[PDB]
Design a protein around this ligand. Structure first.
Ligand SMILES: Nc1ncnc2c1ncn2[C@@H]1O[C@H](COP(=O)(O)OP(=O)(O)OP(O)(O)=S)[C@@H](O)[C@H]1O
Ligand SMILES: Nc1ncnc2c1ncn2[C@@H]1O[C@H](COP(=O)(O)OP(=O)(O)OP(O)(O)=S)[C@@H](O)[C@H]1O
Ligand SMILES: Nc1ncnc2c1ncn2[C@@H]1O[C@H](COP(=O)(O)OP(=O)(O)OP(O)(O)=S)[C@@H](O)[C@H]1O
Ligand SMILES: Nc1ncnc2c1ncn2[C@@H]1O[C@H](COP(=O)(O)OP(=O)(O)OP(O)(O)=S)[C@@H](O)[C@H]1O
Ligand SMILES: [Mg+2]
Ligand SMILES: [Mg+2]
Ligand SMILES: [Mg+2]
Lengths: 432, 322, 432, 119, 432
DNA sequence: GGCTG
DNA sequence: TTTTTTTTTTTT
């Protein structure tokens, strides 16, 4: 029914107002229909009005396509004529036609991706998406229903807004009291929280301590390590949970009986979730990789995480920018934005680590301007905490956590407090 | 590059390939063959879409089926290494028949008026006086095998319009067959007696004045001093009256091959004809006469007014291109 | 399109009043078109009015033409109808047609000049100009645009200019007396206004404060969020309007009764406007999306916004340039130009935020050179204020606002003024 | 008068000293003339002297030319001769020819520009 | 014997382990054999084991092949069969076949090289080696035997190491005993030795003196000068070797008779090498230029130098770097790395010069932190020397050398030795 | 019955 | 050819 759609795009102002915002060039044909719609779209972009038959003929004469295409477009334009119709049958039929064409294009692209990925490398016609984003494309084929959400009205829609304040399902409480106090109830789902410490100051000890604390509070935690093995992170978690020093495990001061007893005692407790550690090579995982990991975890292991942790965003690969194409600023900003998009998609608290510049190392204070790889990371991150350690603090077994970007509350209040990091047990303890 | 050693070496490499034919005119060297990369068409076993062109600076092979395009050196390096060795070494080493009669062909002017081919040529609206330059046959493969034997294996009777071509002396050296049926191997089958024969129809009828050169021999019949190249090499040189010829092609402004030939003609400084102010819209002059009611003397009026040369021809072509 | 031009010359006075000044017999053709235009010109010269079809036919009978030309003119005259096409498209198309025909004529003229130059002096015609006249001939054919307006005169139009001085309809007050004082009556419609600061300083706080202030004045405000959710920003607007807190909303200190009472009391006010909050994914919107959103808003609800707030220009996506086609100085400036064009098209006050490079994130002052993105943004901007906060300022809850680019008024009359920013209420408070 | 220009570039010295710095390859037709001028220009760039007939026949043999181009260049080289004329008419005639060729090239270029713009 | 080779690759473990590491795809043909070997090589790379017939004709042959290639590979795979042959004859025949194929490939490559170089520029197929490196390709093709020579085993190769020790077949002794007692026998073959003096302190008097000493020691010396012409460098060498003041050769106090007599007296000595001086424009010579110069000298003058003296390292250009960099650290380091690579490739002692920092000017001591152009140059040099004659040593015709970096011995043993400069004769004499 | 770049 | 981030280096 392409002729009817074009005719009522021309000879119906009411029809054009609703269907146009959604009409696209890939929904008609590879011949006369697409060319006619391209003519109409060019005229609309140039004059912000629906062209007439004379305007279409003039644009057709000032066009460069061949004789066959010219004749087809001329016949199609000559066949366009308004008919007595009703707005509803046309809008519903157009919605059905657009949905069918979107599904057809989506399945054609799916077949193309499958037949392209099944090719020897270096001859796979790059810039074509991989099989990993096969379902997502189909998800885009179903989100076309002529029902775009205009937005949220402050006065018209306030009961629904008020039924979001006492819900509190968005906030995931910590286990430390100070972190809950500064965040006013803990971190929120669909966010990107960051730890900035430097090199060998913490920043993975803190992530492991957070993972252990969330695990004790009945949470499913997905640790993703881009720079360490699955057994090193698991060893850190074991040291945190079992209250056994990493030196004791290395020096064999803990027996198998004690280890088994502690593990079974933790297992028999109802208030304990599941922690899963996954390792990827440095620069070999992205947002799409994490989504594939999420899907295979949900299917194979029936594991649905809420506290997804990534060891370092700077070590991950952007899923949109080719490697080493853009500078550190753009690449890191894109990676952080994609991670935040993943977090809001799966509705999980995302925790990450970030390096500071060389000038901030061995300094008694770390500012937000000391971020290493990009200034956009603080802009695209919900909460950031700076971990500072000096010789005096190290001798006191304490670290100073400074609130650098506090989006859940006022950062001026409680800006710097001293945590009791214990490096042997990979644990954070409070001083209150 | 060295073209003749590429022609010699390419031939042997493509000789192994089946459906091997030597398309060698008076000025070009081409080799037709089944493509060894893809096996050409799977459905049609008799198609030879692999081609070798050696008339350029570098002799190149191109396949029209799997879109393979390579030099002859890369082809020899990838597929015939024993032939590739000597090929790169030899680089250093060097560095007429007249148609006297037409059997089973009857001229159209001595035919009866109730003949079905007379009704067709009346439907083509050819003037009567030109009817003594046209013959008709029903045994076209038998006629071709009487002239050039072996091209038609079986002489099945096919009615075709005979189109003898005479030189400046008026001697028939080639003849073209127009297909009367809609289903045919080819619309225009040109048959030569000897390979250096003229492919320009009606050179013996050129009078004084400008010479109009068209694409169809039937199209030249409406035209005073109208001759027509029957494809072939389309060589401007082999075309006489170089000082005074008029280059008329079919009216097709959106066709890329026609404007490619226009660009080739106008870059040579020739006198090319332009349909940019034509009141008619048909592709050829015969179609203009048959479908748009045009009489010939209006067409003799239009072209003479719009004869173009050089820079003012280029700007016209610029506006006639799209 | 000669037929359209002639038909709208005869049958349209508005078209005749803008194109007849620039029209010649050489522009049309050498056949029936030129003869028809010559008849029209002769009739308008003899009688100063546009001829009719009957008058044109009578003149054609009076005038003498050969048989072919007579038939062509009769056929062309038969083909004239009103056909009320758009005026803007018609004038643009006739300007293009005139320009192309003039260029063709100029090229033919210079080709004839060159051909005549090669002739021997005895044979050559003295009427044709020399080759030295080739360039200017090609230049006068490039200056045939349709524009009869010459501009202001400062001595012949001072009355109209004084009347324009009294047209203050472009101004929009600020609800803040200091901002009105420094803008000489508030912001103006169709202007790009920017509120720039560092990361986590209160850019979105200022945007929401401006939205609330415009809402309380009766304006229609369209808030386009690029990072936060719709409910999160609406929470800040609620904290500004209801004036309780941000934490008290999340800590349950507000009983539903009070929330309903305050919302209904604000509904009872006749000085309140409409506020719509729209969220977009990062890097997925521009004026092209904004124009479709505007059309959908106008269709679905009686909402034509007077104020358009964009959460951040940087997070926005340029229309023509791809996601990472060019560097920051280009696409950021392109987005700024597109936003200003959208504002001047919709005649709305456009507000957006801008980021500051790391060099001024901890400085007591910020200059225009401290713009994180392209420096073309402080070229398309009109009132680029700047927010500077220090430890002493945060102690007094008083952000410093520095006038960075002031196109409305004097940038240095009140260069730096203190505000009374309340972070809990997301409100700017003037200081007296 | 391309043949005369080439002949007096090869066989004359004052003419060569006067006209060579202003000659360009774009002033000659794409046939034998442009290729012969290419050979002459390459020889002058490589040896800083005007080539002889033997030099060009050596340069023609050591060239990557097709059969038609080779035949045309050889015929044009054979046709060259030193016709005695005056070194005041030659210079002005060459200047006129160069100006005409420049105008022709400019006209073709602007026609191509106008064709490109309408696309 | 491709079929036998493939059959015993598939069906023989000993033959596989013997001949596989020396197998290459460029040995069999341009038909079925190459494709079969490609399949085998891909299988071995993927699984680290010899494929079977099933793996070849099912798991691998179902790939992107044409009909003719598929048929050829199928026939060849079906033709493979194990045959009882002695595993001393098979290895020898395979080695002979590999050597023959390597020679054939080298001959074809040099044919192509000659054909390409015969073509005029702009079509010369860059990255293809020049005609000069034809013999090295043939020599490489000759030595293509199946001998395991990967690196230097410590225990298996101590005989050759002891032969090198006793022969001292790396040292090139100086003519100065002071420079031999700190280098333990002189400079080594594949080394980069550097002089740092300052501005008009030396730095070419020293290089010329070293060249003169090497010339008197029978070595072939190549002096590549970037800052001085060939004639002036040769004049400095003449002043050094003829015991005539540099001013005397300019004013004219030396007659032609005694000059020719001294030159012929030097000529008759069998203990005299050849010194060739070549000048390049300042900043217009890289390591590739030096390699071309070496090849030209070897081909034309039969000159293979043992000492290469570049007059100045910092005014050369980098062959690897394509875009000039304002950063002097990276450019100078790259130049030094390329020069040392050239030295170790040609086994020639490479001496060069470096500029000291302005702070070190008129400083009685120059540390390694006084290097001017780059800090990476001292890291790549095998032996550096500093000339620090400030004011008093000039009055005594002395120069003090510090030995800043010494890879031939301990630089703290004989750090200073106060060399006896003579600027008139442009030489160094000891203070024994 | 031919057709490429 | 400019523009902007980050880093590293060096010179004054
Ligand atoms: N096996 C261990 N036993 C005891 N202490 C350890 C051990 N591993 C790490 N630590 C301590 O933990 C501190 C911080 O460890 P990490 O979390 O690995 O630092 P880091 O910042 O993650 O390293 P990078 O540079 O970011 S990969 C170190 O400085 C050590 O003092
Ligand atoms: N939930 C909250 N409760 C109290 N104060 C808050 C809260 N969220 C943010 N703030 C304060 O708001 C200040 C800045 O607000 P923001 O709008 O986040 O600044 P901004 O980062 O420039 O705007 P963005 O990045 O577009 S959200 C912070 O420094 C906090 O003190
Ligand atoms: N209405 C006004 N009243 C008083 N001073 C003004 C007013 N408008 C502008 N100014 C001052 O005039 C100065 C120069 O303004 P402009 O003339 O626009 O300079 P400009 O370089 O053209 O600015 P651009 O075009 O936005 S880069 C500003 O910095 C203000 O201080
Ligand atoms: N013709 C000469 N006669 C006498 N002494 C000279 C002569 N030329 C140079 N010198 C001396 O030699 C020294 C100059 O060092 P050179 O060997 O020329 O290298 P350099 O000048 O240090 O290198 P640069 O980069 O040009 S400073 C100074 O001590 C001069 O006095
Ligand atoms: Mg770490
Ligand atoms: Mg922010
Ligand atoms: Mg020097």
């Amino acid at each position: 029914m392409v002729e009817i759609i074009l005719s009522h795009l021309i000879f119906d102002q009411a029809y054009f107002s609703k269907v146009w915002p959604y009409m696209d060039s890939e929904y008609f044909e590879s011949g006369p229909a697409k060319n006619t719609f391209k003519l109409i779209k060019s005229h609309v972009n140039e004059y912000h009005s629906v062209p007439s038959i004379n305007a279409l003929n003039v644009a057709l004469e000032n066009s460069s396509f061949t004789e066959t295409e010219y004749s087809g477009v001329k016949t199609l334009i000559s066949k366009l004529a308004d008919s007595p119709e009703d707005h509803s049958w046309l809008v519903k039929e157009t919605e059905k036609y657009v949905q069918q064409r979107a599904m057809f294009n989506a399945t054609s692209k799916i077949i193309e991706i499958q037949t392209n990925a099944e090719l020897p490398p270096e001859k796979r016609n790059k810039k074509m998406p991989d099989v990993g984003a096969i379902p997502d494309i189909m998800r885009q084929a179903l989100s076309i229903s002529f029902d775009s959400y205009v937005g949220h009205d402050w006065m018209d829609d306030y009961e629904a807004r008020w039924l979001s304040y006492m819900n509190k399902a968005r906030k995931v409480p910590f286990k430390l009291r100070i972190l809950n106090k500064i965040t006013k109830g803990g971190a929120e789902t669909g966010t990107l929280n960051v730890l900035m410490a430097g090199v060998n100051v913490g920043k993975s000890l803190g992530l492991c301590s957070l993972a252990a604390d969330y695990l004790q509070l009945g949470h499913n935690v997905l640790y993703i390590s881009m720079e360490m093995a699955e057994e090193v992170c698991a060893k850190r978690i074991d040291a945190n949970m079992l209250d056994v020093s990493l030196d004791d495990i290395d020096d064999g001061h803990i027996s198998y009986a004690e280890y088994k007893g502690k593990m079974e005692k933790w297992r028999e407790k109802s208030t304990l979730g599941r922690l899963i550690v996954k390792q990827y090579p440095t620069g070999g995982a992205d947002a799409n990789t994490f989504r594939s990991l999420l899907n295979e975890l949900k299917l194979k292991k029936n594991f649905v995480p809420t506290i997804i942790i990534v060891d370092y965003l700077g070590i991950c690969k952007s899923c949109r920018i080719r490697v080493y194409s853009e500078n550190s600023y753009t690449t890191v900003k894109a990676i952080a934005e994609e991670l935040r998009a993943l977090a809001v998609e799966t509705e999980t608290v995302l925790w990450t680590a970030a390096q500071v510049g060389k000038q901030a190392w061995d300094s008694s204070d770390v500012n937000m301007s000391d971020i290493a790889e990009s200034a956009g990371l603080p802009a695209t991150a919900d909460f950031m905490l700076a971990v500072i350690e000096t010789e005096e603090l190290a001798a006191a077994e304490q670290q100073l956590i400074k609130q650098i970007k506090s989006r859940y509350g006022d950062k001026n209040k409680w800006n710097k407090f001293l945590m009791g990091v214990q490096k042997g047990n990979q644990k954070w303890v409070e001083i209150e | 590059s060295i073209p003749w050693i590429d022609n010699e070496f390419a031939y042997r490499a493509l000789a192994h390939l089946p459906k091997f034919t030597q398309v060698n005119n008076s000025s070009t060297f081409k080799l037709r063959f089944r493509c060894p990369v893809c096996g050409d068409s799977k459905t049609d076993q008799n198609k030879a879409r692999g081609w070798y062109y050696g008339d350029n600076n570098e002799g190149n092979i191109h396949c029209y089926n799997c879109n393979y395009h390579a030099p002859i050196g890369i082809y020899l390096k990838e597929f015939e290494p024993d032939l590739y060795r000597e090929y790169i070494f030899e680089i250093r080493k060097e560095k007429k028949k007249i148609i006297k009669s037409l059997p089973s062909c009857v001229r159209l002017d001595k035919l009866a008026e109730d003949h079905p081919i007379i009704k067709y040529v009346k439907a083509r609206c050819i003037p009567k006086d030109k009817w003594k330059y046209l013959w008709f046959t029903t045994e076209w493969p038998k006629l071709v095998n009487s002239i050039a034997p072996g091209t038609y294996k079986k002489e099945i009777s096919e009615p075709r319009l005979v189109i003898p071509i005479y030189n400046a002396n008026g001697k028939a050296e080639s003849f073209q067959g127009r297909a009367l049926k809609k289903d045919a191997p080819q619309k225009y089958i040109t048959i030569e007696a000897y390979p250096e024969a003229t492919k320009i129809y009606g050179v013996e009828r050129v009078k004084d004045g400008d010479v109009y050169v068209l694409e169809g021999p039937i199209d030249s019949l409406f035209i005073e001093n109208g001759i027509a190249i029957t494809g072939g090499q389309l060589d401007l040189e082999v075309v006489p009256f170089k000082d005074r010829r008029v280059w008329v092609l079919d009216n097709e402004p959106r066709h890329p091959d026609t404007i490619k030939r226009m660009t080739k003609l106008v870059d040579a400084g020739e006198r090319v004809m332009f349909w940019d102010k034509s009141p008619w819209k048909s592709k050829d002059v015969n179609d203009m006469i048959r479908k748009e009611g045009a009489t010939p003397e209006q067409i003799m009026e239009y072209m003479k007014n719009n004869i173009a040369q050089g820079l003012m021809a280029k700007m016209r072509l610029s506006k006639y291109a799209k």
